């Protein structure tokens, strides 16, 4: 499990995310419990630009660790990409319960009212964004 | 200087332009190379009704890059606003030299030889925004 799984990172960091997939699929096909193997296999969806995909292996993984705030992050993210701006939001609040010191986090629920036209809300959070990193 | 910026774009949106200046002007002390930070600086002025320092600032965006037909056509309506028609006129023909579809700049370029009592000018360029766009 362990060895496929760490083929499939081989490829992902060679940017190869079709043969990451394949691979983190072996991965998980022998340990369906490695909760970073989903997450990893979410990312590499993700990295495709398959964000539904993507979505579903976060929620594996966030089942399996919900403790998780790059995954819940992540998850956001991934609904960020493809306009569901609500559901980024409600995920972005998950990722700041855990580490309410993320500024990415703070930044992207910022762009999440932003875009659906809600600039009081989107001041508010690039605001703590920007308290935590001024340098964006 | 993205969040900054971002900041800045909110402010802006919710009609706030000195606040949107502010942190413009932050987002350009970290990176002094964003045209788009200094066109929307540009702009924000443009709305307060600082037609001088708004020219300043698209000038910057557009050493920047010169193919920005929308900055040009600002451009032109700074000049336009403070009734210097003939320098106008010299930046709503390079924003048409860019995009020679828009109806909005043949429109201004017209009333700005109206404004000069060119009437026959005026008539030409009037023509060519209502062959554009012929509910104006
Ligand atoms: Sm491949
Ligand atoms: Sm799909
Ligand atoms: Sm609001
Ligand atoms: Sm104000
Ligand atoms: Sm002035
Ligand atoms: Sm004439």
Redesign the pocket.
């Known amino acids: 499990a362990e060895a496929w799984y760490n083929l499939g990172n081989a490829y992902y960091k060679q940017g190869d995310y079709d043969e990451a997939i394949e691979y983190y699929q072996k991965a998980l096909e022998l340990d369906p419990r490695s909760a970073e193997a989903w997450y990893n296999l979410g990312n590499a969806y993700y990295k495709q630009g398959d964000y539904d995909e993507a979505i579903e292996y976060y929620q594996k993984a966030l089942e399996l660790d919900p403790r998780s705030a790059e995954a819940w992050y992540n998850l956001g993210n991934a609904y960020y990409k493809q306009g569901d701006y609500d559901e980024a939001i409600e995920y972005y609040q998950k990722a700041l319960e855990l580490d309410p010191r993320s500024a990415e986090a703070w930044y992207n629920l910022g762009n999440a009212?932003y875009k659906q036209g809600?600039?009081?809300?989107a001041i508010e959070y690039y605001q703590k964004a920007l308290e935590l990193d001024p340098r964006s």
Chains 1, 2 share one sequence.
């Open positions: 009212y809600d600039y009081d809300e």
